[PDB]
Amino acid sequence: REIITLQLGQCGNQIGFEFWKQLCAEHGISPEGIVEEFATDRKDVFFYQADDEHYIPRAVLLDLEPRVIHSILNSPYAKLYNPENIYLGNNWASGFSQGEKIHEDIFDIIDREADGSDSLEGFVLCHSIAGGTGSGLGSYLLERLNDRYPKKLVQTYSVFPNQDEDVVVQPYNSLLTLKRLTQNADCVVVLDNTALNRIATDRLHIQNPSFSQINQLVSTIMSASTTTLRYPGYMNNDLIGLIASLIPTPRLHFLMTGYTPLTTDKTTVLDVMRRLLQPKNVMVSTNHCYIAILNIIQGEVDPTQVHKSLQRIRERKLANFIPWGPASIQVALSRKSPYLPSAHRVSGLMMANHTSISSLFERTCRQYDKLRKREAFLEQFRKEDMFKDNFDEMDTSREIVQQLIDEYHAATRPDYISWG
Amino acid sequence: REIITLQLGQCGNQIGFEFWKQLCAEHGISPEGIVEEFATDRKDVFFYQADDEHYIPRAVLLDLEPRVIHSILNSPYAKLYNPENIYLGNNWASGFSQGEKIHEDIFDIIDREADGSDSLEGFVLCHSIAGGTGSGLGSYLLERLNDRYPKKLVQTYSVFPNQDEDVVVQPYNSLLTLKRLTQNADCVVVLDNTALNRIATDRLHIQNPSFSQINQLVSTIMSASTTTLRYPGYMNNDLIGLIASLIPTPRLHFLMTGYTPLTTDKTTVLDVMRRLLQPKNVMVSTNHCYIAILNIIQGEVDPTQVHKSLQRIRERKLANFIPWGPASIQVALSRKSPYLPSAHRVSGLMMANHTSISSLFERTCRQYDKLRKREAFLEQFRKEDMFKDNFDEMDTSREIVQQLIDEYHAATRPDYISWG
Amino acid sequence: LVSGFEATINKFDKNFSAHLLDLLARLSIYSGMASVISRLDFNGFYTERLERL
Amino acid sequence: YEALRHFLLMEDGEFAQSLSDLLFEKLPGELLNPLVLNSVLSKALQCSLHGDTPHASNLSLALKYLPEVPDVLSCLELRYKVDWPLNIVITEGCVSKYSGVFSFLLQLKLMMWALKDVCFHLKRTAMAGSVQFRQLQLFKHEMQHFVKVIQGYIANQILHVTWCEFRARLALEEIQRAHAEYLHKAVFRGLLTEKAAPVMNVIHSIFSLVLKFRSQLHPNFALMQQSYNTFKYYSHFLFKVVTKLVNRQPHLEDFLLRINFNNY
Incomplete structure (x- = not known):
């Protein structure tokens, strides 16, 4: 139905800013919100039909040590969204404690926008894992949202903290945030910063402005994932239907990101299907096997093309299977958006549940285990000591992520009547 | 039929001055009263067709410690209305006693203008609650008007005394005046000073001239409420018809003010209906439920728009209902006035009987109860002592307002065969 | 105004409620389309409290 | 054509997610008067924001039988009345078969509603692990x-x-036969034919197990595991019958x- 998007932290407000600018350019609206003459669509998914003839998005603006949020303030896209709810770092414990002491009025801000829309489908959190500003406050707000409203969906667009990096408390912060992600979320969309960094340094020759270009990538992915909700189809006009097939069980709810053009700066469905199935057109970079894949395509699609393409995908076997059942790559067709640039006219994206992300999890667990065994990299942060003098939350998070790795490896098995 | 408007006190003469200036600019008259060439209307509701070709309004000019009334004197709108009846503070007891000793000739002034018009519909009192100058004299004159003429209507446009305020006898004055308002009036229109102050500090960035801008607001509301009487429609060309539906019983006669543009400094009926029903486009800021709402709209209204808008208002349920019966928001259509500024071409206002004003009443009752329990905030005013040495009128007013709160809460119930 | 008043008023109230229910009920079978009843009782109480089919 | 695709075959969105969703709250002892099903389509068209067109006018939603037997059965037909100068082209015998294929699609939404029920009843427990x-x-899952892959097949x-x-x-004679072939392909590609009756027959068995799986929600875990395995055996047989x-x-x-x- 209707989605209320939450943005917090400098990185989260950055990706929310670029996503809102992307949807402003995509739909027929000005940066003030002035209606265009070209706009089967919907403008009520992220947008309220708001009360000065501007389709003002329902966005929660949160700031914590604002630097780039000031630049968001003096901007032409501050006439698109500002319901005036801006209310005030480098650690998970500091952001968690600061979010703890002021949960009341920001929950009232959440309540205001929850009363704002007529219907609700989910809460999409613009979040950065171990980003300092987003960290801690994001995990605490995740606890507040999932506890306060058990009837709705929680989505968290997340990065994986590896940017070729100094912060040595970052494995502890990412471990605690990942504990919150596994326990207090219905679905998590995870990307790798190093993968998008490699793709960006590949397609161009940029080295310094990597942040802004990564923002372009995640905003394009976020628009592409909700195109089937924003444009009326037949299925996944609600979030829970797209969330349902990829997630077989409440512990494996972490989804890989794919999108078959890495380019927007002739083509058929058959070629982009075989181009999608390689792990180097995946923007997230023993037996490793997908649980379930779902692909959504948008373009000038001949309906016979998806049919024989799926034929070729079967008898080639270029996708990793699921042992305990059928749960396979599903072909979904969506409408080509108005006022999008005419490159890669047939363009598809995929969301997939893969066991290969367990490797990235255990790598970060190994980094945490190294710094935890050495006992020289807690740095004695005062909020970390005052929050937990015994630091048993790190042990609990380690246990939870170990159970997560075991359940991943158990889902890898042909028997998943053996658990972890 | 014809309305005779009474103004008294500095605040009441201020709002009457701005209202008369507003109706002078609205209708086709000069500040002298010179007829224009553009003026389905009526100019006999507040105006007498007076005897020098000036449509002189029937206004009773009362002064008590005049400061701004002197500025009203040397003014171009003193050529519009002056039937020469000006006759001479900071307390309710002082204004009450001063009005008591001279009731005869001011009643003769009332009798003169009552003989002046051919017909009469009601007496509209420009009044300020605990305004000092308006207070006491207004309550005493309310007793004189309702006792002397039981066949007509009494209206009192009233403010709620909260201006972020020093006067500590103000709860006593407001309590005694509210006793008079409940017992000696047919209908009361109440506004909040803090609500209009918040709206004014919102729409502009004014802090010091808040009084004059609030005067603009109440004058616009007073013109908007009597537009259906001043311009011939089909219903509410008399006051008692508009008064009838909102007031179910003689105790609940206090009406909230709404008006859907807060702006005059494209649009349809459907949007302004849903924009009206929020409590933050209301200019007056457990289960709280309206008794009855009535909305009046003025503009270029397609007649199908009110129909499907009322459809949407039903199945959305964005208005608070009445348990014991049907009494709902009623759509009324009025004519767009000549020589009004062309912003918000479809513009509506509402008057509603809500139980939420009981909260404001019991807040002021709690302030009175605090100062009354402490017994240090009567200040020993000599007129307060000489008027009532036993101060039993405060107890009687407290009993009456307690019965009022109980009847409010009883009307909230699904049974109103249980009284208070 | 509370006792003989109530006795005269309640037979009027019973007759008026009867004369209101049968009209809104006999219009509710006829299907704006059903907007006529829907506007007359926005609350939905005495609109048809003695349903037919 | 592009209007009946949107409504009678459902291409309009949060319309299929609204009309069937509001209807299925009753299922039966309800949905018997034609005063709540006669009004709910007019509320669904506002809730889609591609409706209220004059081509979504004369959409009659009415039953031809009163059910006195949730329930996966349906006897509801969504109709359209064609005006005079287009009635020589499209007759109102074609629109009845659009209602006929509509009925199976509506029965299909009944599965993803009962599964949505049992997914929602379990959701309030979680926190829980x-x-x-x-x-x-x-x-x-x-x-x-x-249901979502067989829905992708229909889709x-x-x-x-x-x-x-x-x-x-x-x-002008060609337009009538063009329309009569457009209609004729939909029941043939839909597998509602008597030719594909044995492959349709197992789908009802799966559907009955889905309603029973919704019925239960603990000591009766083994009952639900047993039903799930019987469902998996039936699917393993359907995969060979479709190939045959x-x-x-x-x-x-x-x-x-x-x-x-x-x-x-």
């Missing part, structure tokens, strides 16, 4: 997945292929691929 939570949702045939044709046959009925189609080549993908 019990054995009984994860291993029960594990059963639900496969069952909803079955290929009746909407993508057969809509590309009958736009290459409008690019290809010796007897171009459009059926999708379904064996849809129902199982890399598992024998």
Whole structure:
């Protein structure tokens, strides 16, 4: 139905800013919100039909040590969204404690926008894992949202903290945030910063402005994932239907990101299907096997093309299977958006549940285990000591992520009547 | 039929001055009263067709410690209305006693203008609650008007005394005046000073001239409420018809003010209906439920728009209902006035009987109860002592307002065969 | 105004409620389309409290 | 044509997610008066924001039988009345078969509603991490997945292929036969034919197990595990019956691929 998007932290407000600018350019609206003459669509998914003839998005603006949020303030896209709810770092414990002491009025801000829309489908959190500003406050707000409203969906667009990096408390912060992600979320969309960094340094020759270009990538992915909700189809006009097939069980709810053009700066469905199935057109970079894949395509699609393409995908076997059942790559067709640039006219994206992300999890667990065994990299942060003098939350998070790795490896098995 | 408007006190003469200036600019008259060439209307509701070709309004000019009334004197709108009846503070007891000793000739002034018009519909009192100058004299004159003429209507446009305020006898004055308002009036229109102050500090960035801008607001509301009487429609060309539906019983006669543009400094009926029903486009800021709402709209209204808008208002349920019966928001259509500024071409206002004003009443009752329990905030005013040495009128007013709160809460119930 | 008043008023109230229910009920079978009843009782109480089919 | 695609075959969105969703709150002892089903379509068209067009006018939603027997059965027809100078082209015998294929699609939405019920009843428990939570949702997910792949099959045939044709046959006697072939492909590609009656017959068995899986929600875990395994055996048989009925189609080549993908 209707989605209320939450943005917090400098990185989260950055990706929310670029996503809102992307949807402003995509739909027929000005940066003030002035209606265009070209706009089967919907403008009520992220947008309220708001009360000065501007389709003002329902966005929660949160700031914590604002630097780039000031630049968001003096901007032409501050006439698109500002319901005036801006209310005030480098650690998970500091952001968690600061979010703890002021949960009341920001929950009232959440309540205001929850009363704002007529219907609700989910809460999409613009979040950065171990980003300092987003960290801690994001995990605490995740606890507040999932506890306060058990009837709705929680989505968290997340990065994986590896940017070729100094912060040595970052494995502890990412471990605690990942504990919150596994326990207090219905679905998590995870990307790798190093993968998008490699793709960006590949397609161009940029080295310094990597942040802004990564923002372009995640905003394009976020628009592409909700195109089937924003444009009326037949299925996944609600979030829970797209969330349902990829997630077989409440512990494996972490989804890989794919999108078959890495380019927007002739083509058929058959070629982009075989181009999608390689792990180097995946923007997230023993037996490793997908649980379930779902692909959504948008373009000038001949309906016979998806049919024989799926034929070729079967008898080639270029996708990793699921042992305990059928749960396979599903072909979904969506409408080509108005006022999008005419490159890669047939363009598809995929969301997939893969066991290969367990490797990235255990790598970060190994980094945490190294710094935890050495006992020289807690740095004695005062909020970390005052929050937990015994630091048993790190042990609990380690246990939870170990159970997560075991359940991943158990889902890898042909028997998943053996658990972890 | 014809309305005779009474103004008294500095605040009441201020709002009457701005209202008369507003109706002078609205209708086709000069500040002298010179007829224009553009003026389905009526100019006999507040105006007498007076005897020098000036449509002189029937206004009773009362002064008590005049400061701004002197500025009203040397003014171009003193050529519009002056039937020469000006006759001479900071307390309710002082204004009450001063009005008591001279009731005869001011009643003769009332009798003169009552003989002046051919017909009469009601007496509209420009009044300020605990305004000092308006207070006491207004309550005493309310007793004189309702006792002397039981066949007509009494209206009192009233403010709620909260201006972020020093006067500590103000709860006593407001309590005694509210006793008079409940017992000696047919209908009361109440506004909040803090609500209009918040709206004014919102729409502009004014802090010091808040009084004059609030005067603009109440004058616009007073013109908007009597537009259906001043311009011939089909219903509410008399006051008692508009008064009838909102007031179910003689105790609940206090009406909230709404008006859907807060702006005059494209649009349809459907949007302004849903924009009206929020409590933050209301200019007056457990289960709280309206008794009855009535909305009046003025503009270029397609007649199908009110129909499907009322459809949407039903199945959305964005208005608070009445348990014991049907009494709902009623759509009324009025004519767009000549020589009004062309912003918000479809513009509506509402008057509603809500139980939420009981909260404001019991807040002021709690302030009175605090100062009354402490017994240090009567200040020993000599007129307060000489008027009532036993101060039993405060107890009687407290009993009456307690019965009022109980009847409010009883009307909230699904049974109103249980009284208070 | 509370006792003989109530006795005269309640037979009027019973007759008026009867004369209101049968009209809104006999219009509710006829299907704006059903907007006529829907506007007359926005609350939905005495609109048809003695349903037919 | 592009209006009946939106409503009678459902291409308008949060319209299928609104009309059936509001209807299925009753299911029966309710949905008997034609005063709540006669009004709910007019509330669904506002809730889609592509409705209220004059072509979504004269959409009659009425039953031809009163059910005195949730329930997966349906006897409801969504109709349209064609005006006079277009009645020589489209007759109101064609629109009745649009209602006929509508009825099966509406019965299909009844599955993803009862599965939505049992997924919502379990959702309020979680926080929760019990054995009984994860291993029960594990059963639900496969069952909803079955419906979404057979829904993808219908969501290929009746909407993508057969809509590309009958736009290459409008690019006066020919228009009637063009429309009569456009209609004729939908029941044939839909597998509602008597030819594909044995492959349709097992779908009802799966559907009855889905309603019983919704009925239960703990000591009766083994009952639900047993029902899930009986469902999986029935799906393992359907995968061979669909393959056997290809010796007897171009459009059926999708379904064996849809129902199982890399598992024998």
